Amino acid sequence: ILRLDRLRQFIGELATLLDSRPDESTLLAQAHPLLAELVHQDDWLPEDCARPDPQRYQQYLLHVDSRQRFSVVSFVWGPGQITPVHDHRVWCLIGMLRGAEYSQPYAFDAGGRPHPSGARRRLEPGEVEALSPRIGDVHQVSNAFSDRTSISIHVYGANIGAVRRAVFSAEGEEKPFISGYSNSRLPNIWDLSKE
């Protein structure tokens, strides 16, 4: 029943865009509606990749491009869960699938301590936001709800789980981390005979 074809189509179309070698601004502008389309209807995500954990948010790898030009990840917030302030170091598109999340961008002062740098955004199902080192890479995100699971679909300009990046305390202390992945197996989204 899952519309896995819609995920195959997104992956193919995004790779097709990347093949034309756009600069990052053009990439983000034209990938924005590709991802909006995908998360416009919540009828394709495997149950395995929608499952919340009680102690921490989960990150299910859905697909990695052969040349690692992007990864697609299902980010699953259990009720009331929140990330620390952190960066990405690559381009980043976030598409809200179900529930909702708050996104607060941060910038640093000369002393290295992080402060909000824009309004807190509420991301609704179907909506897409973009981040990158060029336009602002740092933010804190949280489940908008205290009592339901929220899920956003993330597309990043690398194998994000293998990227060395950092979280930041309010005091400005920088701590390296590698996010890794919650699933040791990926969904097989390619066996068309099963549809």
Residues belonging to the binding site are 86, 88, 139
Which residue ranges are tagged as binding site for Fe cation?
86, 88, 139
CA R_g for the chain: 16
Type of residue at 170: A
Q: How far apart are the first and last CA of the chain?
A: 7
Residue 132 C-alpha from the chain's centroid:
12
Separation between Cα atoms, residue 138 and residue 149, nearest integer Å? 24
Separation between Cα atoms, residue 80 and residue 123, nearest integer Å? 15
Place of tokens 């929220």: 150
The residues, ordered by sequence, that sit 6+ positions from 26 with a Cβ below 8 Å of its Cβ are: none
Q: Which two tokens stand for residue 172?
A: 């400005």
Separation between Cα atoms, residue 58 and residue 102, nearest integer Å? 17
